[PDB]
Amino acid sequence: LRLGEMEHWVLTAQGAMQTIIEKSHDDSDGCISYICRNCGEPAIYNASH
Amino acid sequence: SGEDSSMDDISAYSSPGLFGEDIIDRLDDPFSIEDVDISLDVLDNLAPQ
Amino acid sequence: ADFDGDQMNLWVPWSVMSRVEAELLCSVRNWFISTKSSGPVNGQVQDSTVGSFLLTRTNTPMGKNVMNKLHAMGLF
Amino acid sequence: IVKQMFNVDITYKDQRDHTEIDKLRESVQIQFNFTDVNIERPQHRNYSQGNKINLLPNKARLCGLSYSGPVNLAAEVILTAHYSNGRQEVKRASIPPFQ
Amino acid sequence: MLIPVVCFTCGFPIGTYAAIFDKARTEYIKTKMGGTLPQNIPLDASLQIELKDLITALGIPMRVCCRTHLITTLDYRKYY
Amino acid sequence: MKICKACSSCMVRTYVDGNIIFRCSCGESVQGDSQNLLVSSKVYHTGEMEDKYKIFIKNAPFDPTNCQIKKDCPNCHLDYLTQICIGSQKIIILVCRCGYMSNRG
Amino acid sequence: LLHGDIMPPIGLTTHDFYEKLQLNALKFPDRILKPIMNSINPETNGLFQMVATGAKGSNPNMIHIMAGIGQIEINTQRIQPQFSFGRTLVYYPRFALEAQAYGFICNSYIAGLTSPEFIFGEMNGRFDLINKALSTSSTGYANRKAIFGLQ
Amino acid sequence: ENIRFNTLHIHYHTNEIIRGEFISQPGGAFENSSQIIIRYMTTGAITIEINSTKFSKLRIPWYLIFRMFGMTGDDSIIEQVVFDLESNSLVNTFMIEILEKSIHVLDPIFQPVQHELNREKIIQFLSEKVSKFVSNPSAYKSDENAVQYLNERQLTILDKILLPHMGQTADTRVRKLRFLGLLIHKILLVIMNVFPPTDRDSYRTKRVHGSGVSLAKAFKAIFNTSVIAPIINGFKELLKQTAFEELTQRNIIEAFSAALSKNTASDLNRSMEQSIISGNKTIMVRQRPIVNRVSTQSLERKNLLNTISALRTVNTHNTTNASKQTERADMMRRVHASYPGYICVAQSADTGEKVGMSKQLAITANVCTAGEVLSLKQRLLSDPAIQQLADVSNKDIVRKGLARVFINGEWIGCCTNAFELAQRYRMLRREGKVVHPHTTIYWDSMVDEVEFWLDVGRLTRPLLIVDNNIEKYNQACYKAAEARKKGDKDWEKHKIPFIQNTRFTPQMAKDILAGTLTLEDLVAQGICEFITPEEAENCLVAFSIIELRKHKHDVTRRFTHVDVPQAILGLAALVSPYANCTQPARVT
Amino acid sequence: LIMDDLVEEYVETEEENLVEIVESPSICEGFVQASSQTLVIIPDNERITSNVLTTFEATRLVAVRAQQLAINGSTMLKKKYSSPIDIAKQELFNRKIPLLVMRCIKVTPEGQKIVEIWNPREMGIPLLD
Amino acid sequence: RSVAGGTNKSGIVRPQEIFSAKPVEAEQSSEMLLRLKNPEVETNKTYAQEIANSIELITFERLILQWHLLYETYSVMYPDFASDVEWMTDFLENHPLLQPPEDIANWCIRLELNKTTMILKSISLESIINSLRAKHPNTYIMHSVENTASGIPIIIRIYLRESAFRATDEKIAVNVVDKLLNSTIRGIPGIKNANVVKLMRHRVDAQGKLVRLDN
Amino acid sequence: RKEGRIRKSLLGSQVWSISRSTICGNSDLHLDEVGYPISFARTLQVAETVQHYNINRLMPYFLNGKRQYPGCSRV
Ligand SMILES: [Mg+2]
Ligand SMILES: [Zn+2]
Ligand SMILES: [Zn+2]
Ligand SMILES: [Zn+2]
Ligand SMILES: [Zn+2]
């Protein structure tokens, strides 16, 4: 089931967020990205290893 | 030879069913739901009253 | 929307922040007044409009539009 | 369509030269038409090694088969060789009906 | 696929007389159709076939629903 | 256009000497004054001229899909006439199979 | 028109002026409601009560249902002669001058429409369906462009 | 839906000023069709592009086509277009200026042969520019036999793919040139606003192809790739492996029936199934993006009405390059004035882009099969009223006002009076002996032409024939006029009332209901006839027997036919009761 | 030989119309990190933003407080409520919320994040109850 | 909504014109509202109609039935119009101060005026003659006797001068013909039609009251 | 295009924990109420974090589990 472009437009017109966050990240492919902040490239981070 | 049909253009076997089959149309389809992010399973939400 | 085959999506917020926001920011009471026309969106429709007219009219074909106490109570 | 619009007359370059006549030959003209075309009723095989039996449409619907009838073709091939002397050799063969 | 056992609207047992009604309607129709072919009966502009008396004789009451479902239901064996 | 007399070809105009000098690709020249002083032509009300509907107006009485009116023909005294309405000015023309035409047409 | 008495003003051809005159002549008067309300008991008529209280429908709906549909207008103009040169349908002669040949429907919905009247009504309804269908797509295009310009 | 073949389609406004496309099919539905495109460019050039199996996508100057067939004189070439080089006129002047300008316009591709007056050089140039195998343009010129071979191949190709419907031999080159000049004349007539462009939505110039025609179109391309090409490759491999003199009539047979029959891997059946399943859309055969001309859909068995309506569905043609994404998009989805009686005016999709895209045959509408054109051609050529094309010239046609006669789009002669010929052959069709009842006899009153159509894909419906006493009425009018002119007090007594009516009677209605009377009997008896959308433009139809009865004595409304009102709806539309009492959109 | 799954070649047509020198130092090329900012808090008497919480700000405060009470739960509220949302709402209404609202007025090129810090416990609350 | 040219408002034509910032030449429903520069005579409907019909754009091409350019000077003649020398000499006699100048060249247009359009648009021959003469510097224009009834036409022969020719001569002559045809006989450029509408406006009267005026 | 990476995966997204059904009228519901079928109510779940203030309220949900409504599915 898809929350398309127009659903996001409606949610951001209500100024919601935290529901765009929940649905689009927690209930979707939301992940964690690591950036070196010195070069801006995707970095490699692992806590366990 | 001229009589031979082995090297005949097979695109010519499909006779033109419309007048301007070669003119290029750059505009978008006025009836295509392309900028409308609506799921194909709820297409009856657009049905006339 | 109308009830002739229309389908609607429903999702229940499960996280605390989303629930707070749903009950504080996105409740339909905030959309009673249109953002487009600056006027009300909801009201009586079809049977409710005709019913309001029939209830508030002075006379019926049967005489004065009145009800006894039992039927007045039944309205509520 | 098969008997009139699909006549072939194509001349191909000779690609072999390991013989005196092979060096003499520089092209062969392939020329064939189709003489008999007939489409039969849909058939099927039960044993995988038996006679073809009539395939009823319900069986084709159930098994995902194709309600298709065999096409039998009969052709007449004319092969003409060309040499660098102005002569030509003609080998005329008649193809028996085949599916 | 058959005339329903009971009327769909009120539950009156119209299926008690369904077979008798079907047979009697066939016999009655045979006496009203003239030279028109059986499949052309719904096209004959001169036909006036009334089943009111037949249904009344069956004991079915003058109910819109019951008579409707009795006279309009399609029988599967007549088309298959 | 001017057709070359030797080879049946069209010849260019090439106004040089104060008049038209018709030059052909085969080198022939015809001079040709008087008759060919018209270089360009354009009629601006085409689609509404007389010869656009000449065949149609001639065939209008015999066309069974044309409107008829209860008016007497002055020539053969038929009680009906074929009624035509051509052009953006809605020119009404009454025609008959006897050849009568309502003045205009 | 037949006597050559229709003189268009400066700015219109005789065809355009004639079409405008015909469109003005074939509009229903205000007194078309008089027969409708003479047949209607407003304190009892459900259709009139829905229309008059604003619950559903309008005056044109009641007029079309009871009195007559009237002139079928497509893009402010009458039915164009597209069947042939000067013909609107196979049912009408070439260069017909009657209003019925150009989409004027004289019958109400309750009275029933004839075949040419039904064809003109089907043309109008198909126009409505086409506009409804392509409204979604055009609104989608414009809405996406506006959103991305203003977001 | 398919545009009518052997028909000029013109398109004016919506650097090319105008386009005229003519698809020529020599015979029945299964013959190869050659498409010629005539373009007037803003540069002044009139270019003819012939798209066929042999070659395509090559715009030749128009006069070069006339020159290749021996017509090299410019005056004779132009005379083919204007029909009279010594008539002042008004269309002739305009056409002559355009043609003179177009002759001198310089073409980039045909520059060397533009001024060439020898047809052999032009044929050689076209052969070099057209033949796939001539990749060395200079080596073959030394060999005279090579030049002769190229010339003969090009001449055969031109005789086969240039207007094949007017003939496919070398005897009809001049007739083909006359027809091409006529096509250019019609295009230039449209150009000067004498004519409007072809109505893309009208069914007068439309055909419906289903099953046989579409399957044949798919089968040609599938066969040429799954049978001819494998056999060619197998024979090439056999000749390259085995010496030609070593074949003993056994190598040939096995190579034939094993090259395509061992490594099939694509199959005629599988390719036909793919064509049937893919539907009317662009597809790829041998990595070539060709358009599948088969309109198909899954048989959705929602009910029996759904199946029947699916079998009676007429689909608009789909093309990738343009697909008509302009104002034409909502023009093609409208109910056209040519629909009534053939295409259901109510049936359509109510939602999506498919609104008006899928059409439905009306209840009485039928699809004509290809009739016997040869018998009617023999009858017309043997008709003394028709002068054969070989015996008449353009001067005679234009000076004597002769009317061109066409059968299946082929110009076969000219007649003195088009209306009389059309009426006589309509009467013969009514008799039904020498003219088949399903043939179209169309009379174009604007240009005085008679067109006979017997091709497949014609929509047809039966219409009851209305007959009148207009001849007796006119004779009575003449008698009353004579009485008035002689000075009679009651001259009006000679006038008789006008009578128009059908011969259909309630007894025949009962006989139809009794099964003793069929539509074939009614057609044979002359009570009703079959009318095509192109012939329907020659008809004035009363929409009902009530309308006919109302105008029974109206001499100003002389109907040719009467219609049964329910014939304008399809099967699904007729399910709705009292549909004429409902808003038509609700009927959809 | 017949392939059905075509890819529909895609075309873009409207072109965009946007309107010593040594190899590279370690300064011009690089330094993607962006210089750190200092927090310039506007004095309370120089603040120009509203002293009333917006519905966005109040909603965010309640959501943050309730999410924190989900993992924590040491509360200063008097009355006991059975949901973190109600507890956070009452904390905002009772002016006991332990959060602050920072409104970033401007980020200067020199590296200053000019902000206004607002205390929700001295602000107007627009929410319902 | 109207779909005809000059008032194309069907579909999203107007909203796409607005949102795409389409230029003036790309607009299909362009309109303008003009107020008379006299507050006390805005009440006269006849004056408003006069002004509206006065500013309506009429070009020479609107009033041409057909035109023919000729390689003939004057102080020879295409045979189809050899009868033109009668009204030509009549024009010479009736216009003593309009004799042909001594720079007359070979090129010249002969245009047939459409009398139906002239009648319907209230276009007079003198209006054409003065809107082309005091407009075009290198020209010599001649008209027939305007008395023409139905059957004999009004003919305008415009004779060129080498001052214009001062590229192929024939092509520049055709371009001059095109320039002459597109000249504005009457009206203001870009105005295809001009109707008269009743305007509702408010004005403050002498008592300080705001009154809604419908006239 | 619409099915491309940007419009289909970035500007919109497929999500979990969501339901779709036909809508019908119910005049006994308030304007700010929606009628939810129970089978959908046992499919979509609300994440409540157990603390001291809600343990007593959440205990009946834990006890009901997956056998009775209102219950719970995961902890
Ligand atoms: Mg709905
Ligand atoms: Zn790094
Ligand atoms: Zn019952
Ligand atoms: Zn020459
Ligand atoms: Zn007469």
Features:
part of a larger assembly, 11 chains, B: 49 residues, little secondary structure, elongated, F: 105 residues, mainly beta, three-stranded antiparallel beta sheet, 4 strands, 19% strand, binds magnesium ion, binds zinc ion, transcription, asfv, rnap, M1249L C-tail occupied complex1 (MCOC1)
Would you write up a description of this structure?
This is part of a larger assembly, with 3 copies of chain A, 1 copy of chain B (49 residues), 4 copies of chain C, 1 copy of chain E (80 residues), 1 copy of chain F (105 residues) and 1 copy of chain I (129 residues). By secondary structure, chain B is low in regular secondary structure. Chain B has no helix or strand. In chain C, a hairpin with a 2-residue loop joins β2 (59-60) and β3. Chain C is elongated and about 60 Å long. Chain E is mostly helical. The longest helix of chain E is centred in the first third of the chain and has 13 residues, at 18-30. With 129 residues, chain I is α+β, with helices and mostly antiparallel strands. In chain I, α1 crosses α2. Chain I starts with a strand and ends in an 11-residue tail after the last strand. The interface between B and H is large, with 36 and 60 residues. β1 of chain F pairs antiparallel with β2 (64-70) of chain J. Residues 2, 4-6 of chain C line the site of magnesium ion. Magnesium ion is lined by residues 2, 4-6 of chain C. The PDB classes it as transcription. Keywords: asfv, M1249L C-tail occupied complex1 (MCOC1), transcription. ASFV RNAP M1249L C-tail occupied complex1 (MCOC1). Chains A, D, H: DNA-directed RNA polymerase subunit beta. Organism of A, D, H: African swine fever virus.
